[PDB]
Amino acid sequence: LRSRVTGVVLAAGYSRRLGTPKQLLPLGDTTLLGATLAMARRCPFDQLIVTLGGAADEVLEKVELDGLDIVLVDDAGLGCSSSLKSALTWVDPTAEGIVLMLGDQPGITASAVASLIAGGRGATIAVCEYANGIGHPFWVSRGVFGDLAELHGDKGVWRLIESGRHGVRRIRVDADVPLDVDTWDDYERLLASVVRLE
Ligand SMILES: [Cl-]
Ligand SMILES: [Cl-]
After folding, report:
1. Residue 113: helix, strand or coil by DSSP?
2. How far apart are the C-alpha atoms of 94 and 73, rounded to whole Å?
3. Half-sphere exposure of 116 (CA within 13 A, CB side)
4. Residue 18 C-alpha to ligand 1 middle, in angstroms?
């Protein structure tokens, strides 16, 4: 039972405020990126792509990436990455769309991804609607891969979503928006949640 979906975990850059590669931050028995990929592997994807930036060498040494398509890019500047452009070139032609998530959002669930994909069949874009706002994971149909490619950064998908040019389906998830990690404070907050829910 093929899903005809490729998962794309954007894990390049966005680490300058931490002062260390956030992908490698300890999160229990694993790393932050390891935790996200553990979940991503359990989603109904036919293919899983992970993008990495300047810290790729260290990440390759410390995170389990076997069986994944690894897309390596240059650093793009502070608060920016362009890895999605490269990732698209690797997407299997059989994929009807992709699901986008960040390498630093391990709190996303495989059930939410499954519901997102189901709502995304026949929608141009779909997004998760949590109790306290819209957030990742996002669905993007093959028909707008060209528009994605033209975005200036990995975290600029919200501009396509908010543009009104394309249908955007909101898929309800009975949870709050997953935590992500921009700053050291964000990391400690996420770690405390992992410690608590453990
Ligand atoms: Cl940054
Ligand atoms: Cl990086």
Report:
1. helix
2. 24
3. 34
4. 9
Q: Enumerate residues 6+ apart whose C-beta is below 8 A from 41.
A: 48
**Method by which the coordinates were obtained:** X-ray
Tokens of 131: 């109790």
Taking the CB of residue 145, how many other CB atoms lie within 10 A of it?
A: 15
> How far, in Å, is the centroid of ligand 1 from the Cα of 143?
30
CATH code for the part of the protein at 1-198:
3.90.550.10
- Nearest ligand to the CA atom of 59: 2
CA of residue 81 to ligand 1 center, whole Å? 8
Overall resolution, Å: 1.6
- Tokens coding 185: 């404070």
Cα separation, 111 vs 162, in Å, equals: 25
